[PDB]
Amino acid sequence: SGARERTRRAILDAAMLVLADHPTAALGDIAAAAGVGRSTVHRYYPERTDLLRALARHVHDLSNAAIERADPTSGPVDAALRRVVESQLDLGPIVLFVYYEPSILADPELAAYFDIGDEAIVEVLNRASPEYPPGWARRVFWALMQAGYEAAKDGMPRHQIVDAIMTSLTSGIIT
Amino acid sequence: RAILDAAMLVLADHPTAALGDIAAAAGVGRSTVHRYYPERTDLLRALARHVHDLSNAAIERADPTSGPVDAALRRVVESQLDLGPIVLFVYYEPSDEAIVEVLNEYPPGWARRVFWALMQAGYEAAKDGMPRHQIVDAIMTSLTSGIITL
Numbered sequence: 001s002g003a004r005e006r007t008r009r010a011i012l013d014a015a016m017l018v019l020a021d022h023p024t025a026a027l028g029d030i031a032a033a034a035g036v037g038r039s040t041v042h043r044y045y046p047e048r049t050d051l052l053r054a055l056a057r058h059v060h061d062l063s064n065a066a067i068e069r070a071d072p073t074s075g076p077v078d079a080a081l082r083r084v085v086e087s088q089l090d091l092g093p094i095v096l097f098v099y100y101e102p103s104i105l106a107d108p109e110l111a112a113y114f115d116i117g118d119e120a121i122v123e124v125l126n127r128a129s130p131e132y133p134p135g136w137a138r139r140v141f142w143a144l145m146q147a148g149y150e151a152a153k154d155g156m157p158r159h160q161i162v163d164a165i166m167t168s169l170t171s172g173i174i175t
Numbered sequence: 176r177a178i179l180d181a182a183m184l185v186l187a188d189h190p191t192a193a194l195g196d197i198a199a200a201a202g203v204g205r206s207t208v209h210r211y212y213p214e215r216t217d218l219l220r221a222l223a224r225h226v227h228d229l230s231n232a233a234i235e236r237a238d239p240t241s242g243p244v245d246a247a248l249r250r251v252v253e254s255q256l257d258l259g260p261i262v263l264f265v266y267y268e269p270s271d272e273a274i275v276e277v278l279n280e281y282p283p284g285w286a287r288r289v290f291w292a293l294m295q296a297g298y299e300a301a302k303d304g305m306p307r308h309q310i311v312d313a314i315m316t317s318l319t320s321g322i323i324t325l
Contacts, residue, residue, distance in 0.1 A: 023191035077325055078325050081323075101296070101299055103267070103295075104190060104263045104264050104267050104298075105267055105268060107190065108188070108189065125322075125323065128324060128325055129322075129323055132316070132317075132322060133300070133305055133313060135300070135303070136296065136300065136313050136322070137322045137323065139300060140292070140293065140296045140317055140322050141322075143292035143296045144289065144292050146295075147288040147291070150288070151284075151288060156282060160282050161282075164282055164285050167281070167321075168285075168321060169321055169322060170323055170324065170325070171320065171321045172289075172317060172318050172319050172320045172321040173278070173281060173285075173290075174278060174319060175319070
């Protein structure tokens, strides 16, 4: 049953990666991304609709644990922001679906379905904020997290990416 | 062509849209589209070539090596902004050196990833109703000095 929960979570994490790159989550794609048999996916999720509902709950659970562990409201804002960046990078493709600023590739209706908000993060950004328009910092933050996710997907070390996002946030890239 | 026109318009906001939606927006039959682009990946291919050509032509026209770098950066930003989000669509879908010039301790390729992140923020703000000149200003300042302090 420890193995069983591991299998479930592996299928859900696999489905999230597939959905990032494909409108629909075909059974072949999901089973291959999970590294389990097609019949095993069907065992856990008879219908694709059962899988989607379970995926949304899993995404919510991951995001909830991440934000609680980041503890964005306590302590020096520089350290708090770094914990936030680290926490979101570890969520992987979830950052592509954030409601306020979805990735260009995210199916808008999938983003609406997942309904992933960002108030605690908005508040940490505010704590650290010259005269940018309403919502701009929030948009840049999520665009940069998505860039960081893609960089990691493209083979770059997580530590370098976190540092890169932090410097870009505080200093930009050119002088 | 009007099919690729429709594609640019449609895919920009609905990236996972189906061939039939593109046909409708172009004013051609779903029968016609599947004839010139038998698979969705075929259409994406042609669109990407075309959009890449447009993006490259825009950057070259902006002449990033000309005049003050600040003004040059703005011309580059503006020209990509005016092309719209389809520019990112073709460049991110799982299926430019000159920018590194106008830009020149970050990991390799990171600076260009940041440029395109800021463009993404810009396309989204545009959709939200934010004025074009304001968006260009925000991108420029973000590139130069980041968005937060400390």
